[PDB]
Design a protein around this ligand. Structure first.
Ligand SMILES: CC(C)c1cc(-c2n[nH]c(=O)n2-c2ccc3c(ccn3C)c2)c(O)cc1O
Length: 209
């Protein structure tokens, strides 16, 4: 069963801005998603400090980057704390309505789209490069769910039928036709070293074929 939800109006406006504004520095999406994964890995690590059983669903703490040129997807996988169904629905664990306000305003002061993460809504920068985003997630206290949106004002949530991931989150970017440079090994490597060099978890870039 698939449930369909309307985005809050501020978030719809944020996504419409990101999708349609001329902005060439689109590579920042990858910094924001890796940074979110790092935050989520810090969270399960912190929680395991007092309850080691929270790592029963997987002790490895890492980030995988999986390009697939045939499907034209770039997938970011982490083994962080994951998100519950209620988290997913409430703007993927973000305070997105106020963060959008503080952002879509701060733009009016002296601000650039690349500062989106300072306002807690860096995830939505995925729509600089993706026409659709699927978020598959598993939190210790809930089942595995898939969130999906092609923007246009709505998103869906469903129980996920794919492979069990134990614990963590998978962001599948269905790339725009003219954004396939982010499937290229050298380009992903360049972005990671430029923006993510001091992330404290191993980042594995998968190769293809
Ligand atoms: C939001 C996107 C989809 C995303 C979320 C999670 C996730 N799993 N468990 C969590 O708490 N988070 C998380 C982590 C950081 C965040 C929020 C909200 C705002 N910041 C700064 C939520 C992830 O591991 C990867 C991701 O790309």
């Amino acid at each position: 069963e698939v449930e369909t939800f309307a985005f809050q109006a501020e978030i719809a406006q944020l996504m419409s801005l990101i999708i349609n504004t001329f902005y060439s520095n689109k590579e920042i999406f990858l910094r924001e998603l890796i940074s979110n994964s790092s935050d989520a890995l810090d969270k399960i690590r912190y929680e395991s400090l007092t309850d080691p059983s929270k790592l029963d669903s997987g002790k490895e703490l890492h980030i995988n980057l999986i390009p697939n040129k045939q499907d034209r997807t770039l997938t970011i996988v982490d083994t962080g704390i994951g998100m519950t169904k209620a988290d997913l629905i409430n703007n993927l664990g973000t305070i997105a309505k106020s963060g959008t306000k503080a952002f879509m305003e701060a733009l009016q002061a002296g601000a650039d789209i690349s500062m989106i993460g300072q306002f807690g809504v860096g995830f939505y920068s995925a729509y600089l490069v993706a026409e659709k985003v699927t978020v598959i997630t598993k939190h210790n206290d809930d089942e595995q769910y898939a969130w999906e949106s092609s923007a246009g004002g709505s998103f869906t949530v469903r129980t996920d039928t794919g492979e069990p991931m134990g614990r963590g989150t998978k962001v599948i970017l269905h790339l725009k036709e003219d954004q396939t440079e982010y499937l290229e090994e050298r380009r992903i490597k360049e972005i990671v070293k430029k923006h993510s060099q001091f992330i404290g978890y191993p980042i594995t870039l998968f190769v293809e074929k």
